[PDB]
Amino acid sequence: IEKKRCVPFRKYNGGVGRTNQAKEFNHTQGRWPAKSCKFLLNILDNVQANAESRNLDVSKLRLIHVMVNKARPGRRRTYKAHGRINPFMSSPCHIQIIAREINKISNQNRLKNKSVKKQQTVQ
Amino acid sequence: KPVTKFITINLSKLTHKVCYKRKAPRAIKEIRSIAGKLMHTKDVRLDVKLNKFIWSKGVRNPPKRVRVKLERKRNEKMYTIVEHVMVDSYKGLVNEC
Amino acid sequence: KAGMTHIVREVDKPGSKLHKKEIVEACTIIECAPMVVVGIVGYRETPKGLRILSTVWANHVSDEFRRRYYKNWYKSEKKAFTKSLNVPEATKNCLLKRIEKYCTVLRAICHTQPSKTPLRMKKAHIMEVQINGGSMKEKLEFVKEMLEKNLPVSTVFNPNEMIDVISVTKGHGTKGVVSRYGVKRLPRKTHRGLRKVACIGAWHPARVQFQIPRHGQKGYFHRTERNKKIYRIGLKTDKNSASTDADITEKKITPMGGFPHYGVVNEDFLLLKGCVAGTKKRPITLRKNIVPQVSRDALAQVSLKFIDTSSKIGHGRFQTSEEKVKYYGPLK
RNA sequence: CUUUUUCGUGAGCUGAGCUGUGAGCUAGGCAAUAGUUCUUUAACAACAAAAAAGAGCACAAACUGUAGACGACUUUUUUGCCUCAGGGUGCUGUAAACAUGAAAGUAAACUUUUACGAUCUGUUGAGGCUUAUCCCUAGUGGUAAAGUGU
RNA sequence: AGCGUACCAACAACCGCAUCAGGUCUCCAAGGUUAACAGCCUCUGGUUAAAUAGAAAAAAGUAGGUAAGGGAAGUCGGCAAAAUAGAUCCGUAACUUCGGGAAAAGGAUUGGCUCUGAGGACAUUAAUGUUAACUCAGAACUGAAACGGACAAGGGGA
Numbered sequence: 001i002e003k004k005r006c007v008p009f010r011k012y013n014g015g016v017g018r019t020n021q022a023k024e025f026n027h028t029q030g031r032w033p034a035k036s037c038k039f040l041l042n043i044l045d046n047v048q049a050n051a052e053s054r055n056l057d058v059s060k061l062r063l064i065h066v067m068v069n070k071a072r073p074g075r076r077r078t079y080k081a082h083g084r085i086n087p088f089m090s091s092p093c094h095i096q097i098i099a100r101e102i103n104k105i106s107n108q109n110r111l112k113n114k115s116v117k118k119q120q121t122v123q
Numbered sequence: 124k125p126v127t128k129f130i131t132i133n134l135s136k137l138t139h140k141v142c143y144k145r146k147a148p149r150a151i152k153e154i155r156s157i158a159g160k161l162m163h164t165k166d167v168r169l170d171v172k173l174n175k176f177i178w179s180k181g182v183r184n185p186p187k188r189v190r191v192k193l194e195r196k197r198n199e200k201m202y203t204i205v206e207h208v209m210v211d212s213y214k215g216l217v218n219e220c
Numbered sequence: 221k222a223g224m225t226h227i228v229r230e231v232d233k234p235g236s237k238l239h240k241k242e243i244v245e246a247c248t249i250i251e252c253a254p255m256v257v258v259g260i261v262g263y264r265e266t267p268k269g270l271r272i273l274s275t276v277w278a279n280h281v282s283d284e285f286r287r288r289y290y291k292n293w294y295k296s297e298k299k300a301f302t303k304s305l306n307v308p309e310a311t312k313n314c315l316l317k318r319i320e321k322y323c324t325v326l327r328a329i330c331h332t333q334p335s336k337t338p339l340r341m342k343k344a345h346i347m348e349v350q351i352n353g354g355s356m357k358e359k360l361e362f363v364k365e366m367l368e369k370n371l372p373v374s375t376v377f378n379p380n381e382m383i384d385v386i387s388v389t390k391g392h393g394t395k396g397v398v399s400r401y402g403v404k405r406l407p408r409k410t411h412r413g414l415r416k417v418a419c420i421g422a423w424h425p426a427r428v429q430f431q432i433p434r435h436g437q438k439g440y441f442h443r444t445e446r447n448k449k450i451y452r453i454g455l456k457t458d459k460n461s462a463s464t465d466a467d468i469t470e471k472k473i474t475p476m477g478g479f480p481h482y483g484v485v486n487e488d489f490l491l492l493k494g495c496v497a498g499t500k501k502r503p504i505t506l507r508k509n510i511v512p513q514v515s516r517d518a519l520a521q522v523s524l525k526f527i528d529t530s531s532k533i534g535h536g537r538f539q540t541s542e543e544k545v546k547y548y549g550p551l552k
Numbered sequence: 553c554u555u556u557u558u559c560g561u562g563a564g565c566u567g568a569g570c571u572g573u574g575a576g577c578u579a580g581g582c583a584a585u586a587g588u589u590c591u592u593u594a595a596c597a598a599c600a601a602a603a604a605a606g607a608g609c610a611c612a613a614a615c616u617g618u619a620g621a622c623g624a625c626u627u628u629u630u631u632g633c634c635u636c637a638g639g640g641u642g643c644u645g646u647a648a649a650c651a652u653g654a655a656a657g658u659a660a661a662c663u664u665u666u667a668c669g670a671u672c673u674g675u676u677g678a679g680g681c682u683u684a685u686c687c688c689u690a691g692u693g694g695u696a697a698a699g700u701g702u
Numbered sequence: 703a704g705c706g707u708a709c710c711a712a713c714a715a716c717c718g719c720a721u722c723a724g725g726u727c728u729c730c731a732a733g734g735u736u737a738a739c740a741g742c743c744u745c746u747g748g749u750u751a752a753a754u755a756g757a758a759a760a761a762a763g764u765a766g767g768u769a770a771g772g773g774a775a776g777u778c779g780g781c782a783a784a785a786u787a788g789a790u791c792c793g794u795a796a797c798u799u800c801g802g803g804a805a806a807a808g809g810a811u812u813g814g815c816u817c818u819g820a821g822g823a824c825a826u827u828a829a830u831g832u833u834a835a836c837u838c839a840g841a842a843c844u845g846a847a848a849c850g851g852a853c854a855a856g857g858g859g860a
């Protein structure tokens with residue numbers, strides 16, 4: 001949020017600018033999205049609060065599941081030349097998180113004879 | 124800990140690049156940044172008389188030099204107050220503590 | 221590179237319109253503090269190109285030579301060139317005998333001394349200087365005598381010599397076709413603007429060829445220029461290093477008020493006729509001609525009548541700072 | 553595996569001879585077996601657990617501008633650097649104030665006195681400005697935060 | 703007697719698919735400069751708002767400003783841009799339906815300061831006294847030769 005470290009953009013990156021702070025991750029493109037970070041921090045505080053009720057020690061929790069899905073979009077309009085109207089949609093999402101404590105043959109007598117003979121022939 | 128400093132800042136060195144409609148706000152912004160960077164504080168307050176003095180010739184040409192007094196106070200446990208010092212000659216002034 | 225100035229010179233060309241006239245010419249000034257010799261490298265010839273046997277270092281090196289191996293020297297332990305200087309000299313002499321027996325080319329590693337300039341940089345520049353001359357053994361003997369001494373610039377070149385120059389031009393960024401290639405400018409009626417090339421190519425070679433001029437970066441290019449003549453090799457032990465036979469005023473090369481954007485020159489320097497690529501402070505490399513020239517201009521020797529040292533800030537009017545106070549008398 | 557055994561070659565001994573290693577001469581005693589073949593499991597290179605031993609940098613930050621759309625590039629981080637100031641070199645063209653100083657003329661008391669006046673003169677080659685990409689000065693004050701990869 | 707009476711009137715309340723740089727009838731109207739309800743600056747009243755902000759500052763674009771020497775050689779073509787312009791005093795041809803052409807073409811002047819002259823009304827009697835408004839014509843002095851100093855404002859001819 002404060003623009004000390006960045007987020008590498010590896011998938012949806014068409015036109016994203018190149019940044020100094022992306023050498024940390026072995027990449028060339030990065031950005032600082034603040035709204036995403038606030039929304040994710042709210043859920044992380046919820047996870048920690050729920051993990052303090054049941055008696056777990058926060059120092060050992062590892063993020064084993066992070067999943068993001070897209071939700072039903074909202075609807076608005078915009079006005080174009082020559083009397084036309086086109087959509088102006090939005091793009092909401094779902095999120096879910098899980099944290100978890102982390103510590104740290106066949107006899108075949110004919111085959112037995114063959115094995116014995118092979119072992120003898122190599123001595 | 125608390126400390127006072129007296130400095131002079133020449134603004135013509137800092138408003139050299141911006142156009143007419145930006146010359147005074149640029150000086151205000153530069154003064155705030157300089158005081159914050161010198162006192163290691165993020166919360167810097169500017170007295171209203173200094174703002175009045177910076178704008179006294181319109182948006183187009185602020186004064187060339189200004190003498191200010193910086194004070195760091197104990198209140199994000201710390202902050203800085205910036206005031207204006209009226210002088211009639213800048214010729215001998217250096218910065219002190 | 222320090223800056224430029226002008227001189228007055230008499231001509232000795234029988235048959236020209238200028239045969240007995242004093243004329244003005246423009247010159248460039250290069251600061252030439254001495255270098256230091258610190259190493260030896262030997263090459264041998266193979267069907268894949270020249271190849272190295274070994275590198276031999278001197279017994280001691282300086283800190284500005286060691287800084288060139290570090291991105292950030294101020295926060296280091298400074299352990300470069302600390303274990304490999306205690307090597308016994310017997311091994312060094314065995315390696316030198318091998319170099320003598322198997323090699324064909326010698327070069328010497330030398331570095332500059334930025335502390336004697338007005339520069340902000342402290343890393344020294346390192347380069348290799350090839351040594352031509354007699355046999356391989358004589359070459360090795362010649363080099364070993366200098367492994368920890370200084371080269372003055374006057375050892376390498378002579379007065380009135382012809383020299384080649386290597387440097388990097390000034391940078392300008394992205395520049396358009398009109399400025400980058402000097403194409404024609406297009407009529408004022410044009411709809412999408414006029415500063416471009418109209419036709420990129422014919423229809424059916426169905427591509428753009430590499431010969432067509434396009435926009436892109438201009439400046440900061442590598443160049444090698446020939447035939448720059450030496451007019452004077454001045455020293456730092458000399459007080460009147462910018463005076464002549466016809467002008468006995470005691471003077472140094474630096475103009476009144478400092479060389480603009482550079483500083484003051486208080487080492488020994490070269491005076492070159494003409495111009496050289498690069499900005500002020502740009503490092504300049506100086507090579508001898510590939511084969512020596514015997515033309516009428518390469519051998520002719522020059523005698524100077526005046527060197528200008530008036531101010532280059534504004535429009536200078538005096539040659540020394542005492543004339544200025546002598547002209548005005550006492551002030552307020 | 554025993555028997556009588558000669559010639560060469562090195563961990564230690566000093567091109568004495570012991571060891572170790574290889575090649576032989578002389579006389580002996582003592583093996584192999586899985587019901588007719590189903591690849592003759594045989595090479596080279598790795599890795600892991602147990603057994604004896606050899607034990608620093610870079611990125612980020614602040615600074616620079618010889619660089620620049622952004623990345624990239626050129627630099628410095630305590631004899632350095634940044635900021636102010638003093639000097640230097642230049643640009644413009646003589647500041648504000650005072651003057652029983654000048655000024656074509658005017659008007660009004662009883663020689664002189666007073667009042668109004670574009671402009672000019674003296675103090676005054678004065679006053680103002682000068683790196684933000686000018687030059688010099690261990691002159692003054694400062695020089696923070698301590699994160700990431702290996 | 704009965705009916706209307708809030709509010710907007712575009713700047714987001716109306717029509718244009720919309721909180722659209724468009725369209726849409728009437729009345730009131732200060733000071734300075736000036737011929738002027740023009741342009742520019744101001745007082746009463748109104749506002750400091752616009753489907754966004756910060757930094758950086760290269761190509762290229764859009765709306766502008768300059769350029770030594772030459773002066774249409776550019777181009778189908780002087781397209782675009784420059785040059786002129788207010789007022790006072792002089793001087794104006796061919797041709798002509800005698801009314802014009804005509805601001806034809808052309809030439810000179812213009813600030814500031816200190817002065818001189820001209821143009822009325824009224825009451826005691828030719829004489830005395832009081833008392834205004836605005837224009838016009840001359841002279842001396844003065845300045846880095848400038849003065850319709852910004853705004854405003856014809857290019858001309860065969």
Ligand SMILES: [Mg+2]
Binds near residue numbers: 079080081
């Ligand atoms: Mg639209």
Ligand SMILES: [Mg+2]
Binds near residue numbers: 083718
């Ligand atoms: Mg419509």
Ligand SMILES: [Mg+2]
Binds near residue numbers: 409411
């Ligand atoms: Mg067109």
Ligand SMILES: [Mg+2]
Binds near residue numbers: 532533534
């Ligand atoms: Mg110059």
Ligand SMILES: [Mg+2]
């Ligand atoms: Mg005065």
Ligand SMILES: [Mg+2]
């Ligand atoms: Mg600087």
Ligand SMILES: [Mg+2]
């Ligand atoms: Mg009403």
Ligand SMILES: [Mg+2]
């Ligand atoms: Mg409708």
Ligand SMILES: [Mg+2]
Binds near residue numbers: 079722
């Ligand atoms: Mg719209």
Ligand SMILES: [Mg+2]
């Ligand atoms: Mg509207």
Ligand SMILES: [Mg+2]
């Ligand atoms: Mg533009």
Ligand SMILES: [Mg+2]
Binds near residue numbers: 768
């Ligand atoms: Mg101009």
Ligand SMILES: [Mg+2]
């Ligand atoms: Mg021209």
Ligand SMILES: [Mg+2]
């Ligand atoms: Mg033509």
Ligand SMILES: [Mg+2]
């Ligand atoms: Mg033509």
Ligand SMILES: [Mg+2]
Binds near residue numbers: 778
């Ligand atoms: Mg035509």
